[PDB]
Amino acid sequence: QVMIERLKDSTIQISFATVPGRIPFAIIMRALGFVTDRDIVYAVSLDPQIQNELLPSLEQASSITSAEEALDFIGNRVAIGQKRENRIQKAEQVIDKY
Amino acid sequence: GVVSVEDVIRRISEQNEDVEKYMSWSKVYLNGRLLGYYEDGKELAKKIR
Amino acid sequence: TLEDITIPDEAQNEITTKIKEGYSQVDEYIRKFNEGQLEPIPGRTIEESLESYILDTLDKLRKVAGEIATKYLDPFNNVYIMAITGARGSELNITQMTALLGQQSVRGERIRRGYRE
Amino acid sequence: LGLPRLIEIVDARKVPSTPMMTIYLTDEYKTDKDKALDIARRIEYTRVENVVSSVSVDISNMSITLQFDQEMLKDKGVSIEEIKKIITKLKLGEIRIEDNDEYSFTIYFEKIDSIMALFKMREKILNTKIKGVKGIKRAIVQKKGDEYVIITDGSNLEGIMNVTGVDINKIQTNNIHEVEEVLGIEAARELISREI
Amino acid sequence: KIDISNHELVPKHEILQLEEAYKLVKELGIKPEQLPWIRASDPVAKSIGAKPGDIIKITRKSPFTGESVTYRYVITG
Amino acid sequence: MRFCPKCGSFLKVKGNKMVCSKCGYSDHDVEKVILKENVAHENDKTIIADGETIEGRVAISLCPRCGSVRAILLNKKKRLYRCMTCNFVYNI
Ligand SMILES: [Zn+2]
Ligand SMILES: [Zn+2]
């Protein structure tokens, strides 16, 4: 089961089974190969009114700039307390199976 | 006649297609998964039937 | 017997005319709603007051039809005896068996859940 | 009502699920509709969002624009000047209000930086209390005989007892613990018997 | 702060003289603390100046006899 | 909403310019983005419960049992009402 929420902050958070917390929408989108903000925005919708509501979510993930950083962010939840080379592969093998 | 999502995005970005052109187009779903865009969805449904 | 709950043809004609009048009233309410000339009830939105008006009109229609059916029935048949003396049955049962069932409701509202609109 | 209410009564719940009061007025406020409406107006708890018709959040200059419903603003007896005064007293910081119309103004936030804090300020502003006694969610004026009575959706015995024009020897409540704390135990048991 | 003894839910409270309370407890065959209790901090107990060890005579309204008399014993708290 | 022609990130308004924080791009075009939310007060007015009909027999009256303000004036001479929520019959 995959659950998607919208909060009072106008931010979209993703939450599925094998991860304890809520992952921001743009962070989980960057781990799937959507690197730029334009790609995410135009993948969501073509309507300007619809895509103007993604601004709070984009800035929450302004720090993350590449797929590897997002995978590290996910692995920090999936496998905390180990080197920054098995976290990435653990996140990759969780996001591809569950 | 259904144009995929990636094709539409590439047409808008790589070419100079107007976004307002595809805002009047129908969305096509297959088993709950967005499949692409189509101009007049009513006659698409009619021809499928 | 089955003639204790059967009304003549003139009673049915009167009930039909009353039903037509009630439907005309409901149509007038709907037209006023469509033209923006319908006043709401305090604490409720429009399209929620229209439902209340329709329900009131239909309840009054059922009551009037029941009165007509009672008027054109024998006051000494066995169903009436069982009702007035308090053995079994009420006047709502006689109205539903002889005049009309009326409006069906689910949790106080008309039947709405189904397809789109 | 019914079995859940009876269980609430016999289990001695501190606060009911649906509190309620019946408020009687003095002889000079007794038979006037305008005075009863004024009392109901000044006892009902009102927030800022209860009189705002539209909220606009601007990212370019970090400004929040508020639009007010004229009919609601008149019904609550609230004016824009006191709303501005109330907002000025808030913790927001260094702000700047400018009128955009006769029923609008904008808070310009000459200091804030991000959008998260802008939104947090927006829901902080929209939840600010304007007037009313705490706990009173809705007040209804009812005509019983030749008298006008106020029916309340919340409960506050101490607060309502201090309001002008209230008959304090006839006030009713369904909260038995407030009645025990304010009036004593014999009143509490009389109320228990009445409720059952 | 506010006078509440005139409320319509509040029955009449009266402190009972020591001789009358003694006669009552003798003719009931009980100890004073076997009556229902009232706290010294009760809003109506303070209005009449009741101290622990007293017995309060309460007159309530009844639909069967009109007036009904009840006794409470003042405790500490 | 605008995006940087090189980095692809969104552009924010700073003064008369829209600046990309990651690459430092700038432009002469300014586009204003606002988020507008609407609040509806259709049923937020103050209720006055006098047993007077509005349309037909529909009156505004407080039910002693459940507390709804919808009633049907069954009879004017007796002031007889019926709640529309719980069918309770009462007198006001
Ligand atoms: Zn850039
Ligand atoms: Zn009711």
XYZ file of C-alpha atoms in Angstrom, chain D residues 1-146:
146
model
C -29.523 11.207 23.444
C -30.710 7.768 24.461
C -28.467 5.055 25.847
C -25.137 6.836 25.103
C -26.410 9.923 26.943
C -27.621 7.805 29.868
C -24.217 6.097 30.017
C -22.576 9.533 29.949
C -24.736 10.573 32.909
C -24.103 7.444 34.996
C -20.379 7.207 34.176
C -19.768 10.762 35.490
C -17.987 12.178 32.460
C -16.195 15.441 33.212
C -17.360 17.070 29.963
C -20.322 15.970 27.809
C -19.960 15.033 24.166
C -22.350 17.848 23.152
C -22.419 20.637 25.757
C -25.414 22.952 25.782
C -26.783 25.899 27.763
C -30.108 27.711 28.009
C -29.671 31.388 28.874
C -32.483 33.562 30.221
C -32.432 37.355 30.130
C -33.483 40.064 32.560
C -36.815 41.870 32.300
C -35.427 44.828 30.341
C -33.715 42.509 27.819
C -36.543 39.970 28.032
C -38.966 41.087 25.309
C -36.667 42.867 22.819
C -35.332 40.951 19.820
C -32.545 43.443 19.065
C -31.106 43.281 22.590
C -31.169 39.471 22.618
C -29.469 39.463 19.213
C -26.818 41.837 20.578
C -26.163 39.539 23.550
C -25.910 36.500 21.272
C -23.568 38.488 19.020
C -21.240 39.445 21.865
C -21.144 36.014 23.550
C -20.399 33.896 20.453
C -16.739 33.027 19.847
C -15.549 34.365 16.479
C -12.205 33.894 14.722
C -10.673 35.811 11.824
C -11.501 33.083 9.290
C -15.212 33.393 10.157
C -15.413 36.767 8.352
C -12.850 36.236 5.556
C -14.161 35.307 2.109
C -10.843 34.734 0.311
C -7.170 34.516 1.293
C -4.392 35.277 -1.202
C -0.772 34.326 -0.481
C 1.834 36.121 -2.600
C 5.257 34.543 -3.064
C 6.861 37.422 -4.993
C 6.862 39.933 -2.117
C 5.811 37.749 0.861
C 2.406 39.400 1.267
C -0.909 37.962 2.467
C -4.096 39.621 1.201
C -7.378 39.227 3.095
C -10.851 39.733 1.618
C -13.792 40.147 3.990
C -17.427 39.192 3.470
C -19.524 42.312 4.040
C -22.632 40.400 5.137
C -20.757 38.255 7.666
C -18.762 41.272 8.855
C -22.034 43.091 9.545
C -23.709 40.052 11.131
C -20.888 39.492 13.623
C -20.798 43.212 14.426
C -17.082 43.299 13.587
C -15.239 46.167 11.896
C -12.040 46.095 9.857
C -10.343 48.637 12.142
C -10.525 46.375 15.193
C -9.345 43.440 13.064
C -6.298 45.502 12.086
C -5.727 46.398 15.741
C -5.959 42.731 16.773
C -3.536 41.637 14.043
C -1.131 44.419 15.053
C -0.926 42.984 18.589
C 0.206 39.590 17.267
C 3.705 38.107 17.484
C 4.260 38.282 13.699
C 6.963 40.955 14.021
C 7.757 43.853 11.692
C 4.793 43.990 9.305
C 3.094 46.641 7.166
C -0.638 46.920 6.430
C -1.977 48.760 3.375
C -5.589 49.137 2.281
C -6.438 47.679 -1.127
C -10.181 48.493 -0.984
C -12.876 49.417 1.528
C -13.038 45.736 2.569
C -9.469 44.520 2.006
C -5.910 44.983 3.217
C -2.541 43.283 2.829
C 0.110 42.278 5.365
C 3.446 42.739 3.650
C 5.941 40.906 5.925
C 9.011 43.053 5.271
C 11.156 40.450 7.096
C 10.166 36.849 6.310
C 12.300 34.751 3.967
C 10.857 31.338 3.052
C 7.428 29.989 2.095
C 7.065 27.559 5.018
C 7.138 30.458 7.478
C 4.800 32.474 5.245
C 2.228 29.685 5.380
C 2.736 29.199 9.129
C 2.057 32.914 9.574
C -1.045 32.541 7.388
C -2.643 29.826 9.545
C -1.489 31.699 12.661
C -3.386 34.772 11.435
C -6.499 32.864 10.355
C -6.903 31.299 13.827
C -6.769 34.567 15.791
C -9.743 35.197 18.070
C -11.717 38.400 17.511
C -14.395 38.250 20.222
C -16.695 35.967 22.178
C -16.622 33.854 25.330
C -14.330 30.834 25.169
C -16.122 27.535 24.612
C -19.236 29.037 22.992
C -19.313 27.699 19.435
C -22.768 28.884 18.334
C -25.620 30.918 19.825
C -29.263 30.713 18.739
C -32.062 33.110 19.692
C -35.355 31.305 20.334
C -38.805 32.717 21.093
C -40.599 30.586 23.689
C -43.597 32.681 24.720
C -43.309 36.449 24.808
